[PDB]
Design goal:
part of a larger assembly; 9 chains; A mainly alpha (172); B mainly alpha (213); C mainly alpha (162); A: 172 residues; mainly alpha; Globin-like; B: 213 residues; globular; binds phycocyanobilin
């Protein structure tokens, strides 16, 4: 796979050089945040089921037709798929969040997804929507926990966002 | 009362660990993915070699470099890699030329599908196949067959399906595969004293149905 | 590339499940260690050169005949190479420390090591000495966990080479 | 595989002979009962879920220890297996019932079941018990349906029994 | 052995599911038909012999040279065999009717047909005539569905032979 | 989609053989039955609505608390849905009768049933009652084979749900 | 897969509706013809071997070159294939005929056929020809059987034709 | 059983390699965490009973109708069971904390959860409440990392149940 | 698999009870030693290659016949297998050492080994010897490291021994 650390390495390798002191300081800093980073992930995983459940409800309230005969989320079988998919995307996002890198998400998950959706006739727009719905709910938890030491998580929160968004974009 | 150590007091694992099937029972499945790290490739390769050759030891010279390269370019799937290994001098020398066709069939069954042979008819369709057409056509019929495709159809290394209930299983696979597996350090080996011999006794086959032909 | 973080992701991914507590625990481990690891890297990076000189040198003492004409150690080109190589080993060990896994080592150095060495008739032995000599020097500039880490990785190569 | 008809054939074959007129009359009458036969099967299949559910409850009321920590039906995973097994056996029995022959049941289902159970350490006796519990419940439905033309099903009912019993015996 | 009943069981079994309405419908079909099938069998069984004589005979008319010395049709042993064989075909077609599937025919006769015939130099053609001649006779003693059934099976062999 | 006709084709196709008598027998079965099946469908189709009302209703009697505020049965949206759903089940049952196989049911209703229900916290129980209540009503408008058929399919769902 | 019944269903489903009474009456009558339908199929299957044998003879009388060295039906190996193929197509056609729907034929059989033929260099024209030759012979049997109740099969006969023709067209 | 320690061994074993630095780092993580984990377990173990009572209770408040006659919550046997069950979940959660992995939970509780629950018509919902109520109580007796750990595991079940 | 922690759990489970306070204190203490434990493992892994190399030399100096034509370690192919076996055994031992439990070793490594050795004709006694030779060398490193904080490792050292010995015994 790849992640923040490995990445920097690779770059350095092609230059043929030891790591720049500047570059170390990226990683040094990254370490410091770890604890925050972790809790973020933990929050998602802990609430996973819910995140989805929630997002779905809202998705279907909005786009009533998806669940109507002839729509894409009908019948049961399809509905199931649609739920499953949402979850997957989430799963990956989390992965990325820990790694500190989009890659894993892009390569395993997003790559080719659009075209699939197209071929099937799945409306990419709606998919994207769902991803966002998820995003907001997820942040909700990341950002409002209980029994965690109070401090600033923004930096992480934004990175989280970005991941969700890469998803939204590539699907859309 | 409804909570109290039962008198048997066997563990969950217990039943597997007593048989020695603890690793194979719900075996882990190794899949090659669309873009693979250098480690995933090398895991898959190790898992194939271990499963096809029956945990027999493959030296550094025995390995087949080309098949592995093609697997690295993406030019062949894992299912094709399996066929290349199976259709190979090294496989043929271990499980085919020294044994009897009855012995080989049960081996290939185990190697390419973790079960043992379900009944006597399975020997008829695969022995006649071999006289009619090659070894090669026979081997293909295994990988080509729907059961290979339905499970581990593509990009998945074959894993033992024995020791877990599979739909349309015959009874008395469980016992049969226990004769074939015989523990994590055991390995079927062309080169043991008294040669290469069937473990599955032929009378237990007939114990499952035997139709005409 | 194999690092702690990548692995747990991989394992999680294979089973098709979310990262649960199990994996995070592991991750945490990697991060706590990093502080020591990172320190070690800063130390090697700085003294690189000096370590290299010393090593190359050593090898020649250990295997005098190499420097004789018609041998491999002989003539500057070869010496240059020999330097380069050891520097390559040195840079990659540092990468591993920082990455927090053998990954970098495995993929650059180890994979294909044997055959390369066979086809060009590089004797593993040599490299080994280089490393050992290094290990000895490092055993001064570092101390405690930082040291321990440095060793681990250095050794890992010794074992791979042998 | 085999069934009532095929069987009689095979017998005839070894004698080398055309079917006896007497023998035809076995099959002729067998046909006549078909309709009854079918409804019997239908009844089982229709009530399947229940049959099991029921039998299980009773099984566990009796042998409390199975569900106690350290017992064979504990923990969940084991319990699941045990339920699954019951179902399977049932499934086969039904098959037989339609075929009008034990064979199918004996070969795929029963043969080597005992040995499996032994190796695992699953107590064969209890298994057998479960099979009976099932039997009774099943007959219950076969014999007391709604909307079927009233008449005598005994003949079928007994044959049903036998199948269950072969099961019980060979497992035990 | 392939009969209606066996097949649906098989299919049900493979998928791992109970016999549901779908299959029973099919079964029902087999049973309803049986009455006609059974009738046909009683008719063939009775006239067996006569059909056989007529057939064997026919073959010779069709292929005079067979009866010449040094040929296959020649000398009683062979004639006896020829009779036997056709009787075997006759008994098995009857079995199929009753069983309500080609099953009996398939494994007993159709399986290995070719190779047997090749190794002993039995010409399919012959058998065929036998059958045809039969079919023609049967086309008198029977009528309606009973007839139709008889044909189906007789043909099934023609096709297998050719 | 699994119907009698599709299956025999499938089976024939797998072995790579022509449809022979065996399969046609089966087909015939499907067609003979149809007359009853079709009748049943006409009956359900007509009384649809009334059956639905009655069912939905029933459920509430059976599970009063559902209609309380803060529950699922509460507020019209939910009631509307509840209606819709039961109506869909009925439509598939009618479809199946006509198709002469569980096929339609399997693909629309059954496949993915569990997970849907889990994620939205629909309790199977409910549906079941609906069905049962239905079954009871149907047990008046129909009789003999037509009835029997209706039941089969209704049940098939009960079993799938439970 | 699909067939006449299933199809009508599917249509109905997308409208979201119970089947129209009108629509039932299509199926109701379709049933009535069953018996005819069946016999049709039976006739083909019964004569299969012959149908082909015949068609082939004629095909090769016409296009002598196919069987000449350098042609497409030479040598033996190729010839074999060519026969096999014809048969297959037939097999499918029959299937369709029973189903009362083209689908099965199109999806399993015709789909990809043309392209294959192209890649190999097999002359699609000739293939099509063979299909027709078959058609005529086949109808021959469907329409002139023995022991069948006399009546009008035209309706079925034409549908048969169509199937053959879809084949001819898509290959060609 | 999945714990940190078992996993790294497994991974090492698969690749066929010695435990190198990579894995040990991970292990270290597990051990450092343990101190907090262990603390949490001591706290749950002690208050067990009280937690259980409170939970069971809660469920009934949440779902009054359960206690009515003819329901599941009704009659002591059932209540006893209900108690038992919740206690098992707690025991596995404590086991997990100590083992330092979800393992114990997965193998005892989670695997086969669905089908058990389906066949006996246990509504996941119930359990969930139990857990939640627990979580709330635990949210007093514990604090900081110890707490965090307790949560993780409790949740893990919620997610599995739902 | 299993390890020290998991094990204690399992025991507790069969009693049906929460963990005894006494029992916790076993695990609590076990944790404390971790650091020592780890370094032990590290020492083996670090020296692996050599450990084997060494043991082998000695093994072959002693049992000259193994390397003679007709012996078990001749020719090359066989020799290679024997080295490789030694490595595998070692590898496992290490694993155990970390786990704090024999199991892993017994199940994956030792299980079936004797019988294999028998079938091959490999002389079990010699195998056992090799295992010991390894043991001694290994302990050598575990017990005499450099740059580690000085303290007492005996406890670990002995447990190490035991593992080696279980190996020796089961093979022999
Ligand atoms: C961020 C979204 C929210 C937030 C985070 C936050 N966390 C900490 C500190 C810690 N959090 C953890 C978490 C873990 N470390 C691990 O190893 C694991 C896996 C087992 C977890 C779950 C830890 C251990 C710490 C340190 C000690 C502590 O008591 O927290 C902080 C404090 C700053 C720091 O980086 O240490 C913060 C701010 N707090 C919020 O309110 C944000 C919404
Ligand atoms: C130093 C101990 C001895 C020595 C070295 C020497 N090396 C080569 C050639 C090669 N060295 C390497 C090694 C690496 N290249 C890599 O990319 C990596 C991994 C990133 C390593 C470790 C390689 C690959 C080569 C071959 C390619 C090349 O020739 O450049 C030589 C050349 C030998 C020859 O016959 O050409 C030499 C001499 N010489 C000394 O002084 C020491 C004895
Ligand atoms: C339930 C009534 C009783 C029970 C059952 C039970 N079975 C297992 C495990 C297995 N059951 C089977 C059985 C089958 N294999 C087959 O082929 C067939 C039909 C031919 C059956 C019925 C198998 C193979 C297993 C092992 C693999 C698997 O899990 O699928 C268990 C679990 C024991 C274990 O450790 O695996 C149990 C509990 N035992 C009881 O306590 C009940 C009385
Ligand atoms: C026996 C356990 C019970 C019983 C049965 C019974 N059934 C009939 C008659 C019929 N039953 C069926 C049922 C089917 N035929 C089929 O083709 C299918 C599959 C789609 C089924 C389910 C049919 C059609 C008949 C004929 C018409 C009818 O309903 O009667 C009888 C009557 C006697 C007979 O020989 O037909 C009986 C007695 N009656 C019992 O006592 C039990 C309740
Ligand atoms: C009749 C048209 C011609 C003929 C027949 C004839 N048959 C044989 C030899 C065999 N006949 C069969 C056929 C069957 N045996 C079976 O088991 C079955 C399936 C139930 C069939 C159809 C067999 C197998 C043999 C070969 C061995 C044997 O002796 O049974 C012969 C003898 C040929 C020989 O000995 O090489 C003959 C002549 N005889 C005629 O007059 C017709 C030309
Ligand atoms: C009726 C007995 C109870 C009830 C049910 C109810 N259902 C939902 C939501 C859904 N129900 C279904 C069911 C289906 N949708 C399909 O596509 C099919 C196959 C044709 C079925 C059977 C689905 C998928 C949903 C989810 C989303 C949707 O909009 O349909 C609800 C709403 C719950 C929610 O959170 O959305 C309810 C309440 N309503 C009642 O009054 C009874 C208690
Ligand atoms: C015969 C009328 C004509 C003819 C046929 C022909 N076909 C091949 C080879 C192939 N034909 C097929 C056919 C199919 N592919 C499919 O998917 C289907 C439907 C499901 C069919 C029927 C295929 C796959 C092959 C290639 C593989 C094979 O072994 O058959 C040949 C031989 C081509 C060659 O060069 O080997 C021929 C001759 N060609 C003629 O000359 C006739 C006009
Ligand atoms: C049409 C090409 C030719 C034709 C057909 C025809 N058939 C019937 C009637 C029947 N044919 C069958 C045949 C079967 N039914 C089955 O279940 C099976 C499978 C085992 C077969 C083969 C049956 C049973 C009938 C009903 C009774 C009968 O044979 O009469 C008719 C009569 C009209 C009707 O719709 O019933 C006709 C016209 N006859 C021709 O003239 C065409 C050449
Ligand atoms: C409590 C929230 C509600 C309740 C529950 C209840 N459960 C059962 C029966 C079982 N529950 C389980 C669950 C488990 N058993 C295990 O071994 C494990 C893993 C350790 C779990 C989680 C099982 C397996 C059973 C079935 C076996 C048995 O009979 O014990 C019942 C009785 C069900 C019945 O139909 O008899 C009940 C009532 N009780 C309440 O009051 C709440 C509504
Ligand atoms: C070396 C110390 C001594 C020795 C060993 C030896 N072993 C073999 C052959 C095999 N050894 C094994 C064993 C294992 N497979 C495993 O996975 C494990 C660990 C889980 C072991 C330990 C196997 C399976 C074989 C067969 C390999 C194959 O078939 O390729 C040999 C070679 C014997 C032969 O004829 O192949 C030897 C020599 N024997 C000695 O003499 C040493 C004292
Ligand atoms: C025992 C065989 C020999 C020995 C060991 C020893 N080690 C320590 C202490 C530590 N060793 C480590 C090592 C690690 N911790 C990790 O996280 C990892 C993997 C990344 C390793 C390799 C650490 C961190 C410590 C703590 C600090 C330190 O090293 O001093 C001790 C001290 C006792 C204690 O920590 O409780 C001892 C005794 N020392 C010997 O001389 C033995 C032969």
């Amino acid at each position: 796979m790849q992640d923040a650390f490995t990445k920097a390495i690779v770059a350095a390798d092609l230059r043929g050089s030891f790591l720049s002191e500047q570059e170390l300081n990226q990683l040094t800093n990254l370490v410091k945040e770890s604890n925050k980073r972790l809790d973020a992930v933990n929050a998602i995983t802990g609430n996973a089921a819910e995140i989805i459940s929630d997002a779905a409800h809202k998705l279907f309230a909005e786009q009533t037709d998806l669940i109507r005969p002839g729509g894409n989320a009908y019948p049961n079988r399809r509905m199931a798929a649609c739920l499953r998919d949402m979850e997957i995307i989430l799963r990956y996002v989390s992965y990325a969040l820990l790694a500190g890198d989009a890659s894993v998400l892009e390569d395993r998950c997003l790559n080719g997804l659009k075209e699939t959706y197209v071929a099937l006739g799945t409306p990419t727009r709606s998919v994207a929507r769902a991803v966002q719905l998820m995003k907001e709910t997820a942040i909700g938890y990341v950002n409002s926990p209980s029994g965690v030491t109070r401090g600033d998580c923004s930096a992480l929160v934004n990175e989280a966002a970005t991941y969700f968004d890469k998803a939204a974009a590539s699907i859309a | 009362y409804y909570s109290r150590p039962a008198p048997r007091a066997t563990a969950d694992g217990d039943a597997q660990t007593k048989l020695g099937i603890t690793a194979v029972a719900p075996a882990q499945a190794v899949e090659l993915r669309p873009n693979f790290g250098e480690t995933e490739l090398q895991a898959v390769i190790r898992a194939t070699y271990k499963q096809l050759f029956g945990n027999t030891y493959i030296l550094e010279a025995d390995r087949v470099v080309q098949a592995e390269s093609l697997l690295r370019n993406g030019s062949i799937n894992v299912r094709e890699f399996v066929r290349l290994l199976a259709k190979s001098e090294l496989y043929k020398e271990r499980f085919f030329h020294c044994t009897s066709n009855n012995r080989f069939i049960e081996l290939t069954f185990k190697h390419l599908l973790g079960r043992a042979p379900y009944n006597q008819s399975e020997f008829v369709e695969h022995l006649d196949r071999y006289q009619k057409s090659g070894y090669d056509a026979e081997i293909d019929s295994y990988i080509d067959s729907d059961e290979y495709r339905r499970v581990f159809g593509e990009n998945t290394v074959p894993y033992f399906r024995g020791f877990k209930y599979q739909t349309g299983q015959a009874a008395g696979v469980f016992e049969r595969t226990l004769k074939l597996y015989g523990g994590d350090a055991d390995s079927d080996t062309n080169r043991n004293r008294q040669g290469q011999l069937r473990q599955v006794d032929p009378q237990e086959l007939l114990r499952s149905g035997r139709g005409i032909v | 590339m194999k690092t702690v973080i990548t692995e747990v992701i991989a394992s999680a991914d294979s089973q098709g499940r979310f990262l649960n507590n199990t994996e995070l625990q592991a991750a945490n481990g990697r991060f706590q260690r990093a502080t020591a690891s990172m320190e070690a890297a800063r130390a090697l990076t700085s003294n690189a050169d000096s370590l290299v000189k010393g090593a190359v040198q050593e090898v020649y003492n250990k295997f005098p005949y190499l420097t004789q004409p018609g041998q491999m150690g002989y003539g500057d080109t070869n010496q240059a190479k020999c330097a380069r190589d050891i520097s390559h080993y040195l840079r990659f060990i540092t990468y591993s420390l920082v990455a927090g896994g053998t990954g970098p080592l495995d993929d650059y150095i180890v994979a294909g090591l044997r055959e390369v060495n066979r086809t060009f008739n590089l004797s593993p032995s040599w490299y080994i000495e280089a490393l050992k000599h290094i290990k000895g020097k490092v055993g001064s500039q570092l101390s405690g966990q930082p040291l321990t880490e440095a060793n681990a990785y250095i050794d890992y190569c010794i074992n791979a080479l042998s």
